[PDB]
Amino acid sequence: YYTKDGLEGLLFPKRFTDKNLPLPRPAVAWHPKFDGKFDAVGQIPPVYEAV
Amino acid sequence: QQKNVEIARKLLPLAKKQLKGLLDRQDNVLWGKTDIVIRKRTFKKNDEELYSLVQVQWLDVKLWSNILQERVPLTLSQETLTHIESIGGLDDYLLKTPDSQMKSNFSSDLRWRVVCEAMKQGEAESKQK
Amino acid sequence: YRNKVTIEYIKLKEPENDDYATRDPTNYAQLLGAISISRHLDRTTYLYETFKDKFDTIHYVTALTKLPGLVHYRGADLVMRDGVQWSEGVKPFWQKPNAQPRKHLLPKAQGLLSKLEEQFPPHLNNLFPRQTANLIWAYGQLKRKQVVAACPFLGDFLLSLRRDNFLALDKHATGADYAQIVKGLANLQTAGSPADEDTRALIEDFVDQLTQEMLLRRGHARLLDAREAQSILWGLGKLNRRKNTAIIDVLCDVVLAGVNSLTPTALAGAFSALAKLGHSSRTDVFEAMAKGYHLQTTLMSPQDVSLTVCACADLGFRDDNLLKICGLKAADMLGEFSNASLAWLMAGFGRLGYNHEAFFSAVNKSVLAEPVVEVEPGFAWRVLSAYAGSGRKDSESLKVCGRITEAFLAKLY
Amino acid sequence: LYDGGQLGLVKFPVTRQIPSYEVLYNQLGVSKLVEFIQLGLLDHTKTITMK
Amino acid sequence: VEESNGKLVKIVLLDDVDRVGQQGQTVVVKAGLMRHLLFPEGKALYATPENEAKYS
Amino acid sequence: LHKAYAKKLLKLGFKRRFWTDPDPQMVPGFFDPSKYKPRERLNGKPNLRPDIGCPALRQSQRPLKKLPR
Amino acid sequence: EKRTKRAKEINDALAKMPQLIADYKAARKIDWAEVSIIDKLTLSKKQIREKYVKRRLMKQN
RNA sequence: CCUAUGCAGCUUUAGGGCAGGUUAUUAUUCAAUAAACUACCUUUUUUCUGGGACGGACGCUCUUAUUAAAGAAACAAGAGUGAGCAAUGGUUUUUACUAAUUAUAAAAAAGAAAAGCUUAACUGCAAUACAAACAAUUAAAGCAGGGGCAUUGUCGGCAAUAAUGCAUUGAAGAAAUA
Ligand SMILES: [K+]
Ligand SMILES: [Mg+2]
Ligand SMILES: [Mg+2]
Ligand SMILES: [Mg+2]
Ligand SMILES: [Mg+2]
Secondary structure, eight states: OOOHHHHHHHHOTHHHHTTTOOOOOOOSOOOGGGTTTOSSOOOSSOOOOBO | OHHHHHHHTTSOHHHHHHHHHHHTTGGGSOOTTOOOEEEEEEESSSOOEEEEEOOOOOEEEEEEETTTTEEEEEEEOHHHHHHHHHHTSHHHHHHSSOHHHHOOHHHHHHHHHHHHHHHHHHHHHHHHO | OOSOEEEEEEEOOOOSSOOOSSSOOOSHHHHHHHHHTOOSHHHHHHHHHHSSSSOOHHHHHHHHHHHHHHSOBOGGGEEEOSSOOOOSSOOSEEEOTTOOBOTTTHHHHHHHHHHHHHHOGGGGGGOOHHHHHHHHHHHHHHHHTTTOSSOTTHHHHHHHHHHHHHHHHHHHOOHHHHHHHHHHHHHHHSSSSOOOHHHHHHHHHHHHHHIIIIIIISOGGGGOOHHHHHHHHHHHHHHTOOSOOHHHHHHHHHHHHTGGGOOHHHHHHHHHHHHHHTOOOOHHHHHHHHGGGTTOGGGOOHHHHHHHHHHHHHHTOOOHHHHHHHHHHHHHGGGTSOHHHHHHHHHHHHHHTOOOHHHHHHHHHHHHHOSSOOOOHHHHHHHHHHHHHHTOOTTTHHHHHHHHHHHHHHHOO | OOOSSOOGGGGSOOOOOOOOGGGGSOOOOHHHHHHHHHHTSSOTTBOOOOO | OTTSTTSEEEEEESSOOSSSOOTTOEEEEEHHHIIIIIHHHTSEEEOOHHHHHHTO | OOHHHHHHHHHHTOOOOSSSOOOGGGSTTOOOSTTOOOOOOOOOOOOOOTTTSOGGGSSSOOOOOOOOO | OHHHHHHHHHHHHHHHHHHHHHHHHHTTSOOGGGOOHHHHTOSOHHHHHHHHHHHHHHHHO
């Protein structure tokens, strides 16, 4: 689950670091009306793992 | 301001004449809080609009002025009379308001008379005390 | 009633205060209001021609004090800020050096003022300290702009205040009066043509007596705020009143207390004023002013950048954070700086011994891009000094200096 | 487009159903995701994100 | 008096009145009564914040 | 729709895919409180006025009416 | 809560349905113990059905 | 004289409006609302037609002449209709019966009447054809569910050919969202 501001940070992180701006913060939770649509709240810098 | 002019140009030809006559009386009365109101009519069965003017009810009263020790005839609307009573009377209304807000020759002349008289009496009283 | 009707009542809102734009005044108060709120010289000239005989002392004073505001500068000498609106001490534009008035407004202002000066003399003995201060301030503005060359009534205004050991001020003095008197006199002695020798002596003598007897001895500085105190400091600096430092310390204390209210255009003035007076022992005062540039970086103009750097070099006050702000701002405004102005700015950095990578890198790139460079002797040595003092090395500054030398040798007057 | 007065096109009923908001998403097929990985344009040894 | 539309006003009494009240009492009276009799005669003043502090 | 009528619509630029348009406010995480508007009922009445109506539903243009005076 | 109430109402109605069906069928059957037309030996069975069924239904209504 | 995307003036108990006066109600010390009377403003007042007016007509069925395929017009001709039925619908049994409709050579494993039980005058779909500018209109094998009468057949209303009205707007029952 990403918000409008969060999606920008995910896609173009350099657009914030080049201007020395902090990255957008992630959302706290989604509205209950969307239960069954999302599994986790996205983190603006994703945590990569091995596969 | 732009909207006000746009509305005025949509008035009926006879309502425009009445509007000009109302405005020409500004210098002869104590304008005070008098405002202009426009009547608009709409209908359910057609897309037609009629614009007309709402008249102002003028009242002739005699208010007491302690500085001048006189009952001054005045032409007022109800809203202006209510404001004057609330603020503390004619003397307080004229001494608590700048010349810019009066927007009337009759009001300005009356205010100037009161201000000059108040200073003369105050100066004499201050010297006495 | 087959066709149902709905009725709406619309009220036409109007401004609370009347602008005396079209109606003719018919009273003592109305005439004063129309003159004060006049928008154009044609309106003021019309009022004087029609209601000439219905004038009093107050009416003449008001007309003179408002005339400077009706004279507008050329649009080519003004640069508009992005989104800035009129406010307390902030304008939507900044002025280029030595701005000129509009071509078609000078003859109107000169003609109108001549008529006013003719009828004023009879009213000279009915003026108050407030009225005298405003007249002095107005004339100083009218001299900075190319309207007048001297104040005919300067001798009378100064005498009126000086009489009876400043008795008039002792009862009717406020913070504004001192700010306007000193600021007005400074602009009457430096702006435009330099001065007359007798005029300079009288003005400087009066200012020294006024400052010591009123502001210092009687403690009237308690009536001054940060802005008024800053204005006095600027006036003293232009008059080179370096002998008395007691008042300077008092004024600096007032500025320190109300530092938050000053804008970047006011902080730069304080730096320059202190630099001209040579007062460099107030390090604490300098530190407080430097802290005011952190948040108001959007209200800085090339004039503020140039004044701040030059003042710091003269004062010897080196703040890394403040210098960093000036360098970064200047790097983007290189197109606004003149060739002479940009040479002084570079020299200022060299004297301080600060090497700003972005600032010098931008300058070198611009110079190299220029195919034909023509550097004048007046500032050729300044740019060379800045590179040498700033420690710029063979990377690309030797090429820039090489072109500088070649251009200078190309003329060798 | 005028038909002479019959006005046959406006003799049909009107529907007001709202389509799902998910028609605003970008659609990615699983078969297309694999093709990129096989060609070498995607790293399948670590977590794949929308970035 | 707020919704009286000017018909009712707050009055501060400077001298004892037969029916309105006593000196120093703040009461509500008809607008016409104050306009014509109480105010011009000099027996009362309008209940402004300044008058209330000074007299009431 | 009949072939003759369908080609005219396509020739004019008709390309609608759904009965109505999607609502961007319904996408999770993209709700703007400022741009809030209660859902309205679509109007099914064609504008058949021959003076200011649709040119495709009238044979020729008619003169406008007089304003009240 | 609304769904639970609606389900409860339907369940109650279906429970009473068998009795309603029995009354529906019974009300339209001829009771030959109350027929005097046969004693008259004048009308046919169809005419007897209409005469007595209609009276019973109207009285119940 | 007739024909127009016609124009203008005039009239009225043709439609709508209130914007002057009068009148009615209400409110403040020259005001607000109006199914009324006068004045004023704005809008409407089909087509077919052996020229136009006057008269008549405008949907949907049957029949006559233009032969024995279908189709085919005129202000040609001769007759119907804007419904009815809780059985006059569905389905079994019996037999000294074989009619009637606005009109008509329908029909014997068919109908009508008599006797009994019933609600298929259903829910969700449908190959393929008749017709037809289009919109709509007509016939229909077959599949799944729940039923009726029979006991393995039929029933998705009525011998057949007329008993009708797009979209919009409004209203009701239920359900899903927000
Ligand atoms: K003929
Ligand atoms: Mg015709
Ligand atoms: Mg078809
Ligand atoms: Mg069966
Ligand atoms: Mg059947």
